[PDB]
Write an enzyme that holds these catalytic residues in place. Structure first.
Site, short mmCIF file in Angstrom:
data_model
loop_
_atom_site.label_atom_id
_atom_site.label_comp_id
_atom_site.label_asym_id
_atom_site.label_seq_id
_atom_site.Cartn_x
_atom_site.Cartn_y
_atom_site.Cartn_z
N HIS A 412 0.83 -1.20 0.00
CA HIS A 412 0.00 0.00 0.00
C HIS A 412 0.86 1.26 0.00
O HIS A 412 0.56 2.22 -0.71
CB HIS A 412 -0.94 -0.01 1.21
N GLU A 413 1.94 1.26 0.79
CA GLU A 413 2.86 2.39 0.75
C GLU A 413 3.71 2.36 -0.51
O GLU A 413 4.18 3.40 -0.97
CB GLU A 413 3.76 2.39 1.99
N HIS A 416 2.57 4.82 -3.42
CA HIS A 416 2.87 6.25 -3.42
C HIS A 416 4.27 6.48 -3.96
O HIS A 416 4.52 7.42 -4.72
CB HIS A 416 2.73 6.83 -2.02
CG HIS A 416 1.40 6.58 -1.38
ND1 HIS A 416 1.20 5.57 -0.46
CD2 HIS A 416 0.21 7.21 -1.51
CE1 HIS A 416 -0.06 5.58 -0.06
NE2 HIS A 416 -0.68 6.57 -0.69
N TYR A 454 -10.26 3.08 2.08
CA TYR A 454 -8.96 3.73 2.13
C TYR A 454 -8.61 4.38 0.79
O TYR A 454 -8.11 5.51 0.76
CB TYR A 454 -7.88 2.73 2.53
N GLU A 461 -4.00 7.75 -2.70
CA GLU A 461 -4.31 6.54 -1.95
C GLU A 461 -4.97 5.50 -2.84
O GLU A 461 -4.68 4.30 -2.73
CB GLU A 461 -5.21 6.87 -0.76
#
Lengths: 499, 529, 529
Positions: A412-413, A416, A454, A461
């Site tokens: 998920h990170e 970015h 999310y 995101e």
């Protein structure tokens, strides 16, 4: 059990024993070596006369300095033991007209609550020292009070006395703490999760002042962890009148064993720890950091010398996180396109970025605040890609509010960071994600909110979340995006193509 | 931190006194203390030994080496147990002789290992020459060889050596002297030098069965006719037909085990003629004929109260000795040798042991030794003779006869019958007490016709290649089949046990089988054939 | 901090039990634990051994030295593997004889190493005397040599030694005795002293094939005719035409490897006559006639349940044993010896071995051993005989015949045919079970004319220098070419196998090939020549 004991004592029979039950010999070997003194200490704790006598003796030593103790010292210890939980008068009241909500919009008014949240925090020491790993006006008070409290305990602990301390599992890992008790039997703990807990639990560090009990007393419902510590003669600790001790900060402890025992028909978790110099363990930490780096530097073509990895974790749960970096890193590679790894690493080796794994709040960990424009603009969470510092932050201590495990949290990170690299390739002098803004916003209108809550937050995101699902290790998750967002799939497939 | 090891024999003290056993795991051998429950399932034997003897037996093999196997791999299995002396026992077996005068009687002979009574630790055998007439025309030996009162006959025999012991001899070969009668020493067989370069493993022959046996006469110039023999001797021989072969114990060197590389080299320092006396004075001696009616000898180390050092050896009960010396076991707690219970055997003791043995049964208040058998302590120097009670024996404890009833019972299985003979399949042991058969036919009115009506014409029973005994009538007949004058005439068959046989013509030179004690063995009518 | 090494053999224990291999890097040799993926491509053999034996095989070479090559560079390759005892096997080959009376019958001889059944560890051979008449007029030796009833013939033969074992002998050479018949020992060949200073390497002759063979008669003054021989023997010899050569086990010393300087010195302390007994009691013995129908003997170390120390050695499955002993390989997962599948081979077992092996086949629930080959455990002391299933055999396990049908295919390749003979190219192995050929001519009306119509006239086939068999007609013809009474007359050729041959004239002295079982081979009309 009795039979095994007998066979162990007889020298001539000792060899026979080790031959047919190797593990059993090992088991009995560790018991007689350093697990028999623990039997005596625990037995004495049931006799009222003994415990009272032990408590009385220790007091009759430290009494002299207690009389010498100054008032200021007692005052500091008071506000230490007990946390202390009309100043606006301006527009904030006009506009205003969980714990922070009870005590106490998507515009310029939610920023006043972020600043107020820092100004409305209770004046505390033990969490701050642990949260920070060691408003400005309050800081001056912090500095003086910490300095004053520090220059109090000149009495080192210098036979071995054992103490007890009950701790909330949510302090070490709130994700496992929710399922530690068997769903069908609250008195039992599932061994399956338990063996995992012990897996990489070899040593632990206490950064704040531990407040422990001299004699074991019943624990609270959410406290099933009964720490015991083998003290060192040089460790300075401070006694209290209510039968408690305040331990020196920056203490190192080596975990020798962790097992489940039964007491009063209910099961609990015992962690056996020994006081050791923190400096001695920190030296072990640097070697572990070097080994992970050296291994992965040759992996994705990285230069051998570059660290690219620093272990900044400081907490009661540090060692499982450290060993879990290998697991996380091994998964990250095995789960991402080899050519994507090469590309992203080239984008990082060219600069001076780092993968910061920590257990302290993001604004105080290493550089987050150095890239913030306003103090109230600080953000704390598991992590987020910061273009200004070109660094990846992974907060071990925290539990991802969405991801099911750590792999999902990282991926998920990872989105970015991927967006930033794509921006570097395209607009050199312009916002890395300015091209993805008008491109994903439109995609976020038709069906952006349909997915996880999310990703609905914003394009960044959503993009980061979509990348994880598209590259998840569970084909089901990957399949879901295909039959739920057939449109989104094609363009999403196309940015990762860009080499 | 070294376990006390007084005897310096590798094995620690406590193990030796109380009991141990070696067991192999994965692939490494280590010595372990006896566990009653966990070792028994694996079929390991519970050992005992002397913490103060480098070789409890006193034989040239250490207590430790024996159980682990670093030892001349040729020692028989039963001698691996620490309480059984391993040593050689060589006696001489003579296969056949031939005679002439310094018309040559070339006859095949049969030999048996002997033991007689006040019996001493010295091996001797006794050959017995067959009396049956292989040739028709050879009546009166004195004439088949033109032997005159002033003549001399030459003797030419073949012999082989037999190892019935438990350990190998290597270089030397024993000297052995022939003696006829009470004091007539005919010859001493020279000790050929540096020629017995082969090996005598237990239960083997030298030279092996595949080669010609060693010719006795040199065929060289040492003596023109070494085996001379005066007339009078020949007379003595004709009346007795028995010779004896006495051998001494001058054996060779000893094979020792070298730890450095596992090479077995013959050490020139240790010599058997000095060791045997030690074993021979500190062990109990048991002679047993269970296996094949041949004298098998084993020696067990027993305690001697009078000597300090000797009390160190583990107490030895008789029952275990039999268990460990020969192979007896207890499937259901009942002692037996391949089925045959212990109760079918006699116990005979030399005069010394008897007084001693009568004592032990008194402090136990028992009369049947076979019950309280497991409570008898063995002392040094006892001699015990255990032979099957069912057979009759001669002066030299050789099997010579038996009670007829067992003998008859032994014959009830007629595999086939015709007019040319019987093909039986009898237990190999009985056919060691049967010299031959006399066949006769009985008229329906009581007449009696004996076919082979000569003292030396009874050996008519051969054995087929399938272990089937075959009786040939045409052998000592007129090469003609068997005729029967009446399908109602009875056909009688008698068997003659060794003890009841005749070896020479009578006073008036009777050759008929008349005055011979005959046991009836078969009687089927003419039509029952 | 030292790796354990109980056996003191250089290789550590754990290494020995689990698996190791020798490798060469730049030019230095190092020991490595077996790695599955990196070693197979290198053609390295996976070794195993005993952590408790200075020489797992028990032969005089340590486990370490064998695989490392520090060893007599003369040991044959197949014996380099740690589980194959390398030791000598000496038998005697007699090349040709000549006879006369104390006009000399000089015949060439052929010998084969023999093996019969209860077969024991003792070497023996068998010579066969040529029967063909080199001279026309030399009918009846009894007359070719003026031999009278009261005469004596002198025997003088030529011999060479053959080493078919796996290790060299150095100084000594075995004594060996000649014997005719069952027990007629003609002579024992003396052990010449300090003369065999040369070496007998495996598969070599002494003296080598390039030198005169050792004359049997001394030619000195020791005995004028040591080998005398009365008339009756000659008769016996004429009827049997077979002799025997028994050899004992007296070899020399052993060649050992010296670590200090790599010199191989003959040690006067260690002597082969002490080691073989160890070897002979702890190994499985395998006889194979695959290569050239000759008896090859190899020994493999197998476990003996009864002995602790012996259980230490790695378990040996039959299938792997054959793989390492002879050269079988696994091209397609089917066991074969240079093409010939295992199914063309017999398995014969001694009665002892049978019991063990029949048991072994029962717990596996199989009936064809050829399938479950990889599941048969080898125990100590078994004797196994692997012979070609295609041939007929006699009593002494020599190849003697075969089914006729196979024989014909061996001739279906006529390289050339003329009126002077045939030039065949047959597999070199067949031509040792064929005694000769019967040639016959058939009149256009069914007559039959046998050219060499005498028992002793069938050696009509030769072999050319290019390995081509050549049949010569003019040899036993009338030194005349081959005549044909009709270009339509068939030419018949018969072959005579050894087993069906006659070696002496018959009852009525028949010389005709009438009552001889003859197989038709080549038939062709007069114009097809």
């Amino acid at each position: 059990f009795a039979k095994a004991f007998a066979y162990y004592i007889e020298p001539q029979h000792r060899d026979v024993l080790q031959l047919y039950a190797p593990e059993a010999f090992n088991y009995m070997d560790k018991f007689n070596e350093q697990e028999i003194n623990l039997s005596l200490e625990e037995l004495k704790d049931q006799r009222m006369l003994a415990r009272y006598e032990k408590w009385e003796k220790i007091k009759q030593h430290y009494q002299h300095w207690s009389d010498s103790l100054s008032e200021e010292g007692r005052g500091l210890l008071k506000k230490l033991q007990i946390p202390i939980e009309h100043s606006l008068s301006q527009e904030e009241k006009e506009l205003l007209k969980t714990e922070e909500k009870e005590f106490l919009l998507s515009e310029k008014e939610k920023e006043f609550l972020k600043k107020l949240k820092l100004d409305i925090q209770p004046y505390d020491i033990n969490q701050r020292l642990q949260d920070t790993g060691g408003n400005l006006d309050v800081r001056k008070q912090y500095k003086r009070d910490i300095q004053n409290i520090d220059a109090l305990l000149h009495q080192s602990i210098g036979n071995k006395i054992y103490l007890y301390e009950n701790m909330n599992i949510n302090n070490l890992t709130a994700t496992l703490g929710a399922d530690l008790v068997d769903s069908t039997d609250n008195t039992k703990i599932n061994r399956g999760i338990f063996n995992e807990f012990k897996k990489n639990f070899k040593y632990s560090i206490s950064s704040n002042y531990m407040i422990v009990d001299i004699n074991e007393r019943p624990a609270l419902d959410n406290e099933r962890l009964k720490w015991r510590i083998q003290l060192s003669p040089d460790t300075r600790a401070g006694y209290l009148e209510n039968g408690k001790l305040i331990l020196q900060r920056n203490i190192g402890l080596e975990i020798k064993d962790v097992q489940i025992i039964k007491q009063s028909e209910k099961e609990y978790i015992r962690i056996d720890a020994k006081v050791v110099p923190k400096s001695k363990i920190d030296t072990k930490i640097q070697e572990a950091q070097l080994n992970i780096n050296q291994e992965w530097n040759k992996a994705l073509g990285l230069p051998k010398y570059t660290k690219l990895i620093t272990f900044n974790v400081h907490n009661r749960y540090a060692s499982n996180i450290v060993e879990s970096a290998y697991l996380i890193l091994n998964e990250w590679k095995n789960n991402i396109q080899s050519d994507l790894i090469k590309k992203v690493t080239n984008y990082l080796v060219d600069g001076n970025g780092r993968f910061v794994f920590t257990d302290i709040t993001l604004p105080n960990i290493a550089e987050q605040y150095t890239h913030q424009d306003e103090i109230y603009e600080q953000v704390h969470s598991k992590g987020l890609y910061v273009p200004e510092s070109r660094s990846i932050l992974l907060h071990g201590p925290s539990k991802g509010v969405e991801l099911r495990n750590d792999s999902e949290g990282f991926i998920h990170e990872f989105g970015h960071a991927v967006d930033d690299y794509a921006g570097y390739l395209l607009d050199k002098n312009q916002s890395d994600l300015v091209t993805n803004s008008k491109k994903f916003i439109d995609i976020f209108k038709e069906e952006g909110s349909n997915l996880t809550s999310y990703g609905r937050t914003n394009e960044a995101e959503f993009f980061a979340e979509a990348f994880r699902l598209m590259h998840s290790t569970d084909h089901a998750e990957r399949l879901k995006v295909q039959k739920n967002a057939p449109k989104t799939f094609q363009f999403i497939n196309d940015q990762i193509k860009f080499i | 931190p070294t376990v006390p090891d007084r005897d310096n024999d590798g094995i620690p003290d406590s193990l030796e006194v109380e009991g141990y056993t070696v067991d192999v795991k994965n692939k490494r051998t280590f010595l372990s203390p006896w566990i009653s429950n966990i070792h028994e399932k694996k079929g390991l034997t519970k050992y005992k030994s002397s913490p103060e003897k480098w070789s409890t037996a006193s034989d040239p093999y250490s207590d430790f080496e024996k159980v682990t196997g670093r030892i001349d791999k040729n020692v028989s299995p039963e001698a691996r147990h620490p309480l059984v002396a391993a040593y050689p026992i060589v006696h001489v077996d003579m296969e056949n002789i031939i005679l002439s005068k310094n018309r040559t009687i070339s006859k095949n002979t049969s030999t048996s290992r002997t033991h007689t009574s006040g019996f001493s630790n010295s091996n001797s055998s006794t050959v017995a020459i067959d009396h049956s007439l292989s040739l028709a025309g050879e009546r009166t030996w004195a004439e088949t060889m033109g032997l005159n009162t002033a003549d001399t006959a030459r003797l030419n025999a073949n012999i082989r050596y037999v190892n019935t012991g438990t350990a190998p001899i290597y270089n030397v070969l024993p000297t052995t002297s022939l003696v006829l009668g009470k004091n007539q020493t005919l010859a001493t067989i020279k000790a050929k030098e540096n020629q017995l370069s082969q090996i005598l493993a237990p239960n083997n022959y030298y030279p092996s069965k595949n080669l010609a046996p060693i010719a006795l006469n040199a065929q060289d110039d040492f003596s023109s006719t070494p085996i001379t023999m005066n007339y009078n001797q020949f007379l003595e021989l004709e009346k007795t037909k028995q010779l004896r072969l006495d051998t001494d114990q001058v054996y060779g060197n000893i094979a020792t085990y070298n730890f450095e590389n596992g090479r077995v080299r013959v050490d020139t320092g240790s010599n058997w003629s000095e060791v045997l006396p030690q074993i021979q004075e500190t062990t109990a001696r048991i002679i047993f004929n269970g296996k094949d009616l041949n004298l098998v000898e084993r020696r067990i180390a027993a305690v001697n109260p009078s000597d300090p050092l000797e009390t160190t050896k583990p107490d030895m009960t008789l029952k275990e000795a039999l268990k460990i010396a020969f192979g007896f076991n207890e499937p259901n707690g009942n002692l037996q040798y391949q089925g045959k219970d212990i109760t079918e055997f006699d116990f005979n003791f030399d005069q010394q042991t008897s007084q001693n043995i009568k004592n032990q049964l008194a402090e136990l208040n028992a009369t049947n030794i076979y019950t309280v058998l497991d409570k008898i302590k063995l002392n040094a120097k006892m001699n015990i003779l255990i032979r099957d009670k069912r057979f009759h024996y001669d002066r030299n404890n050789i099997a010579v006869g038996a009670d007829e009833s067992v003998v008859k019972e032994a014959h009830r299985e007629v595999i086939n019958s015709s007019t040319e003979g019987l093909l039986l399949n009898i237990d190999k042991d009985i056919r060691k007490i049967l010299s031959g058969y006399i066949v006769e036919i009985e008229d329906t009115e009581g007449l009696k016709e004996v076919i082979n009506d000569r003292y030396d014409m009874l050996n008519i029973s051969s054995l087929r290649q399938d272990g089937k005994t075959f009786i040939d009538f045409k052998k000592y007949n007129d090469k003609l089949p068997l005729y029967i004058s009446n399908p109602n005439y009875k056909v009688n068959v008698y068997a003659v046990t060794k003890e009841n046989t005749i070896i020479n013509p009578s006073e008036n030179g009777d050759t008929s089988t008349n005055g011979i004690k005959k046991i009836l063995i078969f009687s089927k009518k003419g039509y029952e054939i």
